[PDB]
Amino acid sequence: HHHHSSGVDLGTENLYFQSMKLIRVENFEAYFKKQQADSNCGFAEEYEDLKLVGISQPKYAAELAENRGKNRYNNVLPYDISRVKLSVQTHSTDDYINANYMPGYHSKKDFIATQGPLPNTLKDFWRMVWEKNVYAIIMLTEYWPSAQDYGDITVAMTSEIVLWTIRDFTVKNIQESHPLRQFHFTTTDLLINFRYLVRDYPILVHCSAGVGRTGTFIAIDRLIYQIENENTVDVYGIVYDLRMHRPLMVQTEDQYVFLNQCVLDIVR
Template identity: 25%
Template sequence: MHTIQTVAQYVYLHKAALVGHTVAGSTFQVKDMNARLAALESEKPDTESALSYSREFEAVVAACDAIINQYNESTQQPEESVYQNTSGVADKRKNRLSNILPNQAFRPVLIAEAHKEDTYINAVLVPNLTRDNHDLLTQLPLPSTVTDFWRLVTQFNVGLVVAFDLDSMDSDQTIGDFLPKSEKKPFENDRYLVETEPPRESTVAWEFPLTVHQKAVSGMGNSVPLLHKTLTLLACKDHKLDPESVLELQYKIKSCRLSKKSRIIFMCRNGADQCGLMCVQSILLDRLEADQCLAVPVAVGSIKAIRPQVIPTVDQYKCLYRVLKLAHESKNVYGNVGDGSL
């Protein structure tokens, strides 16, 4: 009911998966990781076919751009470009940045639970290791989209929210108040009451247990049961692309996953930068645990073709590899954290 299962969407994802094949030598066995990284570290590769970080990243970006352009041309409706929002003037008030908009083929459609309720949210469904259209990337809520955010959480079976940039809430007026102030001061609006318990702090995040209570609203049918939901929010600290911090945060994310069926929301101020890195890194670490063969461009391409602003710099691209190396050198510690489910 929530996902868009169309031929065009599957073709789009298939093309995204082909990104890895356009980047020569990008797939490698785990046992060859050190040699692979040594080659990437060199900005002057020994052979013409070899790629440095910069050249590989540029090839991935070019391939994703080509996929997006082909998709836009195939719709034969330029106004429905993944870079444009066609859902109406009202939706433009629900986007923080005019150049980071959802690909309409992968946008989650909210259920209208009340009369004339909008179904739009600036978010995209992205694949994880085993499922298409499973996890979500979104922006931190605007004051006008706080209720929409909690609708997304409750309607799409979200069990974990991985949030960045929350430390700027007090100074950034574009970020809506959507969380409890403390266990004694819950968040409340006309649709939801959100309570928390005392958080647990680690070196990389604050872990908040949340309970969401849905309120009855005018226009909602009596047959709709009012929801009571528990989940976890990780308020992530700034990792500054430090591989050890990124990997530790991945351990924390893995330990907080509830089940194979529940979704993860990755979010930050623009809905792409820091949260996109964590989303892609999570896929790669799960692949490292499950398989002996890695293809970083495929993982990046599968998300970047849906949300082009994900992994925007070569420094983030390098970080993906360096975290994989650290995880491998840690003797599969990552695979022993949490329940191993997705």
């Protein structure tokens, strides 16, 4: 615990000053109207203000020569500070998975946001799932046994209900097993509903780059907790916080604006 003087770390200064924008829930009606005017231009400004948040943070792991083929996109790289570090065997660079711990409402490790695994990273994906005791997966878009072995880990599917759909697997170290529930997702009703569905039961959330839909989902889960326990809304401040842990969370003005659309609904 230390405070910083002005001038040391500009990023830290942004954080103290304008990292957050609280609205009481009983004023969100009036406020949402204000921002959906001149065609969303108010939300476009909040969204533009967030654009540089957290992008100055180091990402050495992700940029090493050996870890190039483990990243789906070159512009979506995990920040060193929040990345998920796997165990090691042959060299340090085994530890790498394009994945970050994201804060939820209750703690900082509530989520792992990650990209949809590559052919050459499926082994690492399941390793991550086992090592970090992952019990739920949220697929927001075929890396699973329709049992298959992936490295030192064996994955068996044990239930499939197609309605979104729900799947149950067992993950086992081939040298001990935990069970897993994956929630596969396929108006704002559907998103809000899909989440309340999910919440009955570290939550790994992936879309394709692990950033747009992934961010919208995590965000809405947090907003809902804040709407039920506090009686307030902070879309700006949640995305800010997500950006401080992984780049591009909520990737388009439309997703940002859409989050706000979901909130406006819950509030009625």
